[PDB]
Amino acid sequence: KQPISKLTRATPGSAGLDLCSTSHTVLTPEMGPQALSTGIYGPLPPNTFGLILGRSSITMKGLQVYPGVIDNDYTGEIKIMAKAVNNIVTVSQGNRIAQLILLPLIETDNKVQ
Amino acid sequence: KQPISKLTRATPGSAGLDLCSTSHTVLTPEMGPQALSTGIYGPLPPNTFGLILGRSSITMKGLQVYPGVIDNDYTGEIKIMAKAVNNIVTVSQGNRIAQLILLPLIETDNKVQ
Amino acid sequence: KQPISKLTRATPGSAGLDLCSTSHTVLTPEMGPQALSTGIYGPLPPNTFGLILGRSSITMKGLQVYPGVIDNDYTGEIKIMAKAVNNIVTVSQGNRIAQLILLPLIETDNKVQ
Numbered sequence: 001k002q003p004i005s006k007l008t009r010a011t012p013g014s015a016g017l018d019l020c021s022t023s024h025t026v027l028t029p030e031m032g033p034q035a036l037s038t039g040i041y042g043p044l045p046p047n048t049f050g051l052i053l054g055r056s057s058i059t060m061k062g063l064q065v066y067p068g069v070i071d072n073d074y075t076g077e078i079k080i081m082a083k084a085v086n087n088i089v090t091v092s093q094g095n096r097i098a099q100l101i102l103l104p105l106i107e108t109d110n111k112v113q
Numbered sequence: 114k115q116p117i118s119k120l121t122r123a124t125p126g127s128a129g130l131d132l133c134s135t136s137h138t139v140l141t142p143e144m145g146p147q148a149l150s151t152g153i154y155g156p157l158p159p160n161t162f163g164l165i166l167g168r169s170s171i172t173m174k175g176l177q178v179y180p181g182v183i184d185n186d187y188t189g190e191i192k193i194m195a196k197a198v199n200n201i202v203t204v205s206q207g208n209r210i211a212q213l214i215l216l217p218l219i220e221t222d223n224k225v226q
Numbered sequence: 227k228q229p230i231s232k233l234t235r236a237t238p239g240s241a242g243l244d245l246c247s248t249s250h251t252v253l254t255p256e257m258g259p260q261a262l263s264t265g266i267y268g269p270l271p272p273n274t275f276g277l278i279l280g281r282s283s284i285t286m287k288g289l290q291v292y293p294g295v296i297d298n299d300y301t302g303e304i305k306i307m308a309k310a311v312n313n314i315v316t317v318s319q320g321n322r323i324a325q326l327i328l329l330p331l332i333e334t335d336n337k338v339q
């Protein structure tokens with residue numbers, strides 16, 4: 001398993017950490033949402049949560065990444081939820097498919113469970 | 114009307130507050146976006162705004178929730194904008210359909226109106 | 227070129243800054259994602275990044291805006307990635323199509339490039 005600390009940022013001003021698909025995968029529109037493996041696992045730094053978002057270059061090529069909320073204490077594998085919009089899309093191993101944004105986790109008094 | 118304070122968090126490390134649909138509703142792809150009632154109303158805690166996002170279990174079952182921005186001072190009913198992706202989806206009363214994330218509302222000098 | 231400082235907020239409690247399309251554009255579902263020009267350019271205020279999100283009134287009328295991450299140091303034109311969901315959609319010049327949300331850019335030790 002690899003932790004979020006092994007992810008890289010493309011440039012210092014980049015909001016997101018790059019997420020790559022560990023497999024070659026073909027997607028068609030009729031398949032609906034598919035969860036792509038990344039080999040990267042939670043959890044997140046204290047007081048943060050994560051959002052998985054698309055890369056614009058990839059969205060413009062017809063692969064939609066559904067925004068995904070990564071809880072602070074999730075310890076499973078971070079997967080990318082994606083769908084081919086209109087056309088057949090092929091994702092090659094190591095292609096950068098999405099990005100992870102880290103955001104502050106605000107405290108509230110809402111009851112738990 | 115019920116306020117956001119009555120929402121619950123599944124676990125202490127959960128980023129989102131659960132939102133449930135108050136009605137049983139059937140959605141098909143050709144229907145396009147539908148606004149699901151929740152019986153929960155703004156406004157939000159000072160200096161925050163809200164984002165409505167999907168639950169990954171629900172997105173993987175073919176119901177897409179369009180990310181929705183909840184303004185700090187909105188006092189209407191928070192509705193979930195959703196679409197069946199490819200298949201017929203049935204939402205039962207009380208099913209958890211989406212989640213509300215609270216985020217800091219940054220001040221800027223942009224002119225207002 | 228116009229900077230983000232020229233954008234306006236609809237009301238003081240509005241989370242987003244309004245983004246308008248500078249052209250008249252017709253979109254159909256089979257076209258897939260389209261990048262709409264706005265004439266607004268990065269970069270963003272220090273320690274922030276941007277998210278492009280839809281307006282709910284517009285999403286409910288069948289135009290989906292794909293959430294887009296605006297990096298802090300991007301100096302190009304901010305474009306709106308959008309898709310007609312099911313029907314033909316016509317966007318007129320000056321119509322408010324999306325909104326820009328500003329969020330804190332959290333520092334991490336992740337390696338760069």
Ligand SMILES: O=c1ccn([C@H]2C[C@H](O)[C@@H](COP(=O)(O)O)O2)c(=O)[nH]1
Nearest residue numbers: 052068069070071074078079168169
């Ligand atoms: O795109 C996503 C969305 C969620 N999850 C994992 C992390 C979340 O903590 C967990 C539960 O999802 P939600 O209930 O937060 O949506 O699933 C992902 O791997 N990818």
Ligand SMILES: O=c1ccn([C@H]2C[C@H](O)[C@@H](COP(=O)(O)O)O2)c(=O)[nH]1
Nearest residue numbers: 165181182183184187191192281282
């Ligand atoms: O998914 C959504 C998106 C918005 N709204 C309500 C709250 C917002 O303050 C208001 C106006 O929407 P926007 O203009 O912020 O998108 O509509 C919802 O109930 N659900």
Ligand SMILES: O=c1ccn([C@H]2C[C@H](O)[C@@H](COP(=O)(O)O)O2)c(=O)[nH]1
Nearest residue numbers: 055056278294295296297300304305
């Ligand atoms: O909806 C979007 C998404 C991105 N970009 C520009 C700003 C980003 O800094 C840049 C690279 O996109 P990403 O790699 O962050 O997705 O493209 C846009 O104009 N509109």
